[model samples]
Target: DYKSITIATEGSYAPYNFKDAGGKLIGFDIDLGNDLCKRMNIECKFVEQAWDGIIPSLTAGRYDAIMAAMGIQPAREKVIAFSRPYLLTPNTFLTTADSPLLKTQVAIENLPLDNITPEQKAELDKFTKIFEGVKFGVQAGTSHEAFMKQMMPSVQISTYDTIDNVVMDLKAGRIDASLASVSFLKPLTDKPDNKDLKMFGPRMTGGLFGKGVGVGIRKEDADLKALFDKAIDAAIADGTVQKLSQQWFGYDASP
Candidate 1:
C-alpha cells in the first residue's frame, strides 16, 4: 500500500517536459502526472534522467514509471509495458524556411503508411524524391532514427544524443533536415530565433511511429500500469488531457 511513486522524465523536451533554470521539473508531463496521482490518491515524484539511460534505469527499478513524452514503439514494448496513450502526434520534417520543401504542394499528411490514397501516394513519392540525397538528423535511440534507418535509407542519417543537438546541427547546416514529432518541433519553430526554421513535407503516423505517446512502466508492475491506465482514461474523458495539451502546446495532443 505505497502512497508514493517515482516518475522519470528526460526533462529537456519543452512543452512536454522540461526543467526551468531553477531546476524545477515542469511541463505538460509533470502536470499530467500530478493530476493522475491525485485522482489515484497518491503522491507523485519525478526523477530527471538522461534519455539514453531512461529505459535501462526504469527496468533497473530506479523509478516507478516514465512520463517523458515516450512513444510506444514495438521494440520498447518488448522490454517495458505502457499505459494507454496520453498524447498523439505524427512525425514531420523540419528545415530552413527558404528550402524548396516548404514550397512543395503536399497532398498527404498524417496518414497511415499503407492507407495512403492515390493523391497521397504521389506526394509520398515526391517526398522521397525531395530528400533523396539530403542528410537527416534525429535523436539517437528514437523511433525517428529507426524510421530513417529503415524507410529513408536513401538519405544520410545522423544521430544525436539530444534533440537540442539535432536542432543546432540543422541550424548550422550540418544536416539538411530533421524529423521528429510535430508536437516537439512545432514549439521550436515558433521561437523568435528560429524564424528561419519551418516544418515541411508530409505528416506521418502508424508503422514505426507506434501508437502515440504513453507512460512507461515496468512490465511486472501490472497494478501500477492499470492504475495509470484508469487515471489516464478519466483524464482523457473528462477533457483534462485536451485542456493541458492546449495550455502547453497550443494544440490538442491528447489521444
Candidate 2:
C-alpha cells in the first residue's frame, strides 16, 4: 500500500519530459507518471534530475522511483529494477530538410548505423560516403552515444546535457544532426516552429536502446515495485496511458 511516492524525471527530454515555455515540466513521461499515480491513488511528486544520475539516485534512496523517459538497459538493471515498459519506439536522426543525407534512396531504406553485416557494410559505405564531415549530436551517457560511437566512429559526436539543448543546437545549425526517439521528435515536427527540421537516416531500435521506458525502483523495494506494477497494469487496462500518450504525443505509447 503506497500512499505517496517521489518520482524522478529528466525534466529535459522534449515531447517526452521537458520544461514548457512557462518553465513547467510537461511532456509524455510527466503526464504518464501523473496518470499512473492517479490510478494508484497515490500522491506522486516529480523531481527534476539529470538522466545520468537517475538510477544512482534511485538506488541511493533519493526517490521512490524514476518515471523519467528512461530506456531500460541491462547495465541499469544491474543496479535498479524496472516496471513493465510504458513506451517502446525506435530512434531516428533529425537533420535539416535540405541536408544531402536525404539525397539517396538506398540510404533512406537501410540505416546501418547500429550493426552491419557484410551486405550492410557495403550499404553503410554508401551511407557514410555522403555524411563524411557531418557533426552528430546525442544525449550524454545514453545508449544513443554508444550507437553513434559504434556506427560512425570517425564522425564528430558532440554530447549534450539534455535533449532540449540538443534540439536547439540542431535548429541553430550548431550541429548537423541528433539521435532521438521518434516519439520525442513527433511533437516538435508537428509544431510550426520546426517546419525546417526533418527526420533522416536509419531508424534504430533494440540492442542499446533496450526494451522501453519503465519505472526504476530500488532493488529491495519489491512491495513498492508490485504496487507500481499493479498501477501501471491498471493504466494499461483502463487506457489511461493510451489517453495520456494521445494527449501528449498524438499517438499511442502503451506497451
Candidate 3:
C-alpha cells in the first residue's frame, strides 16, 4: 500500500549500482529498481550511501528499501528482510593479469555453499591450500569478506571501504588478490583501463554468498518486501531483468 519509496545504494558497485559520468545513479540494480517501482505503481527515489553504514542507516529508517546488490544471507536476515533474489551469479577471485594464481587448478567451476558435496569439499580444500598466507582484498561487511574469514581461514585479508579501493589495491599489488561477484568483476576486468585484472579459480555461490543478489528491506517492512517480490517476479518473467542484466552486466542475470 505504498505510493512512494526511497531506496538506498552504495552507488559505487559497478554493474550493480554506481554513479554515471554525470553523477547520475545508473546500473543494473538502479535500472531494475526503477522498473520494479513502476510495476508496483510507486514513485521511487534513490539516495547514495556509503557501503559500510548502509544497513545501519536502513535500520534507522532512513530508507524504505535497498537495491544495492545485497545478498540474502542468514547473517543479514537477522537484521533485515530480503525480497526473492533477482539475479544469480557466482563469486571468484581477481588478481593481476601476470599473477601465478591464474594457472592454479580449477577444481570445480560452480561451488555451492549451502550444501557442499564431498567432491566440492575436496575441491574447496585445494583452494584453502592454494590461498594460505596470500593477501586478499575484500570490501568490508560483504559476503566476500565473510567467506575469506570463515572458509579460507589462512588467507590474510585486507578490508577496504569500497569495491573500487579493493580493486585499486589489487592492481597495485598491495593485495595478492581480491574477491567479488562475477557479475561485477567480469565487466570490470573487461574494461580497457582494467585490462590487467583477471578473475581466476572456481566460481562460488550459495551459503556464505547467500541465495543470490536481492533487495535489502527493513524487517518491519513486510508490505514493501511483498511489493518488491511481486514486481521482481514480473520483471523476470517479462525479460526486463535479463534485458538490463545484458545491458549492464553483459550477461543474463535473471533468476
Candidate 4:
C-alpha cells in the first residue's frame, strides 16, 4: 500500500480551490482529493503552487500529483499523464450589468463555442467589433487567456493573479470583461456584492479550452496513475463524484 503522496493545487481558484475565512484550504478539489486518498488507502498532503508553474513543478518532482482544476490539453499530455476528467464545464465571459454587449442576444446563445451557426457567427463578429479596442481581463496562464490571445489578438488583454481579483475589477468597471469558467463564476455572482454582473459572449469549450479538468501526474508514475483512474471510476460509479459536484457546482459533472 502507498504510504503518502503529495498533491498540488493552485489555492487561488475560488469555489473550486481557495482559502476559507478560518484560513483553511477547502473547496471542490480539496474535497475530491481527500476522497480519492481515502479510497486509495493513502495519506495525502496538499501543497499550494502557482498555476503557471504547476506543470514545470510536477516535472521537477515538486509534488507527486496535481489535483488543481487543470484542463486537459494535447500539449500537456506530451509531458504528464492525467486521470479521466472529473469535471467538465464551459468557459464564458462576465460583463458589467449595463454593458451594451448584453444587447447581442444571438451571440450569448451560441455559447461553448461549439455548434456554431451563421447567425451565431454574425452575432460573434458584432460582439467582437464592440470590444475592438477595449481591455479584457483573464487569469494568467489559463486557457481563457490563451483563447483571448488567439481569437482577439487586437484587443488589449490584461492578466490577473486570481479569478476573484478579476471579479473585483469587473465589478468596479476597471475591465471590460473577464473570461473564465462559468462554474467558477456562479458562486461569485450569487453573492450580494456581485449581483449585477452578467455572463456574456459565446460559451467556449473543446480545442484550446481543453477536454475537461483532470488530475496531473508525472509520466513515470504509471502505477500511481492506474490507482487514481480506478478510484475516479469507483467515485463515478457510486455517485460520489455527482454528490460532490452537486454540493459545489449545483450539478453533476462526473466526466
- Backbone atom clashes (below 3 Å) for every candidate: 0, 0, 0, 3
Cα TM-score of candidate 2 = 0.89
Q: Which pairs clash in model 1?
A: none
lDDT of 3 by residue, 169-219 (tens): 887778899889899889998899998888998889988999998999998
Better of 1 and 2 by TM-score: 1
- Give all candidate RMSDs, comma-separated: 1.7, 2.5, 1.1, 2.1
Candidate 1 wrong stretches, greater than 4 Å: 114-125
How much lDDT does each candidate structure score? 0.89, 0.79, 0.89, 0.82
lDDT of 4 by residue, 33-78 (tens): 9999999999989889888789999999988999888888777888
Query: Lowest summed lDDT over 10 consecutive residues: which window, candidate 2?
Result: 107-116
Q: Could you tell me how far off, in angstroms, the CA of residue 187 lies in candidate 3 after the best superposition?
A: 0.5
Count clashing pairs, candidate 1. Answer: 0
Error of 3 at 171 (Å): 1.2
| Candidate 2, 1-255: lDDT as tens digits | 678999888877777777878888788778788877887789989888888787788888888988777888777788888888887777777888788776656534534334556876666566556667888888888878876777667778899888878888988899998778778877878888988988875666666677788888898899887877898888888888888888888888777
Model 2, residue 87: C-alpha shift (Å): 1.1
Angstrom error of the Cα, residue 194, model 4: value is 1.2
Better of 1 and 3 by TM-score: 3
